[PDB]
Design an enzyme around this catalytic site. Structure first.
Site: not given
Ligand SMILES: O[C@@H]1[C@@H](O)[C@@H](O[C@@H]2CO[C@@H](O)[C@H](O)[C@H]2O)OC[C@H]1O
Ligand SMILES: O[C@@H]1[C@@H](O)[C@H](O)OC[C@H]1O
Length: 302
Positions: A132, A173, A210, A238, A240
């Site tokens: 990001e 990413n 997402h 990632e 969902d």
């Molecule tokens: O708290 C955790 C979150 O941060 C999540 O992990 C993150 C989700 O947001 C994305 O931008 C990131 O790449 C990812 O690593 O999911 C798990 C939670 O427990």
């Protein structure tokens, strides 16, 4: 565990994997979760164990208990692994963000990349080297790395990564790369072309994906647009979707299926209760760790 492995079905189309995430808690909280992972998925991304705050809580002092577990589980069960993530402005120890000296930040940055990458050298399929780093409008995010080091941190990161473990696929990413024409998608594409032309070893672009309900159909074009960046590959990292409808999921699966550079998909979680967006039931398995409609739909589309 579902009887039909979508990972198997996806791979049959020449794709590398259809995976999910995990860490000690979820891999042990019950019998079904790890059983589902082993049976229906083929790749694993540590949900939090490999982030900066969890790997280097204090300068030069690493803590690899959690990551060691995730990696070991995956390796022991024939699952590919995607490291995540080496450089990010979130889940970053205050000791890092407080650094103001460029050469000091570069030293630290390289040390973190090295120590972490070296520990799993040869066991990691792909690393999310940068995470990001773009503002929604396509410009570079003003994180400590950007403010202190400048745009050169991108080169420094990838080049270090490439030398430490030349066997991993180096990725950048980001989220919101979900539709062609979106400012962030253009910013990602233009920057990557520039960087690649400069010799920066960027092997792939990771698209978090997402989504909200109904955003699935727009994913295909975003992928096509990302393909113009010129990287060797791309992937949905990632995934969902709020509502987890079969239509959104099949669309996203097809978005990847019909794009040559898309090597795989990683669903951000196994069952709803363990989702970081649990309130939206955005996963393929429900509260009872049973397959939802979307899972079966994906299976029958492959
Ligand atoms: O708290 C955790 C979150 O941060 C999540 O992990 C993150 C989700 O947001 C994305 O931008 C990131 O790449 C990812 O690593 O999911 C798990 C939670 O427990
Ligand atoms: O268990 C650790 C393993 O996961 C890593 O790859 O190499 C060092 C070991 O201590």
């Amino acid at each position: 565990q579902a009887s039909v492995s979508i990972d198997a079905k996806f791979k049959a189309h020449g794709k590398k994997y259809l995976g999910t995430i995990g860490d000690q808690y979820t891999l042990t909280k019950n019998t079904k979760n790890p059983a589902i992972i082993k049976a229906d998925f083929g790749q694993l991304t540590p949900e939090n164990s490999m982030k900066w705050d969890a790997t280097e809580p204090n300068r030069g002092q690493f803590t690899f208990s959690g990551s060691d577990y995730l990696v070991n589980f995956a390796q022991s069960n024939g699952k590919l692994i995607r490291g995540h993530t080496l450089v990010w402005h979130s889940q970053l120890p205050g000791w890092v963000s407080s650094i103001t000296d460029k050469n000091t930040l570069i030293s630290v940055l390289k040390n973190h990349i090295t120590t972490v990458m070296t520990r799993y050298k040869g066991k990691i399929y792909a690393w999310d080297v940068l995470n990001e780093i773009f503002n929604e409008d396509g410009s570079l995010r003003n994180s400590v790395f950007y403010n202190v080091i400048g745009e050169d941190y991108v080169r420094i990161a990838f080049e270090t990564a490439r030398s430490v473990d030349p066997n991993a696929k180096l990725y950048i990413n980001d989220y919101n790369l979900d539709s062609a024409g979106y400012s962030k998608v253009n910013g990602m594409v233009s920057h990557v072309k520039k960087w690649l032309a400069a010799g920066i070893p960027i092997d792939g672009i990771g698209s978090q994906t997402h989504l909200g309900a109904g955003a699935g159909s727009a994913v295909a074009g975003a992928l096509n647009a990302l393909a113009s960046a010129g990287t060797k590959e791309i992937a949905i990292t990632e995934l969902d979707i709020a509502g987890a409808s079969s239509t959104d999921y099949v669309n996203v699966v097809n978005a990847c299926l019909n794009q040559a550079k898309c090597v795989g998909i990683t669903v951000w979680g196994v069952a709803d209760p363990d989702s970081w967006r649990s309130s939206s039931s955005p996963l393929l398995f429900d509260g009872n760790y049973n397959p939802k409609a979307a899972y079966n739909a994906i299976a029958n589309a492959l």
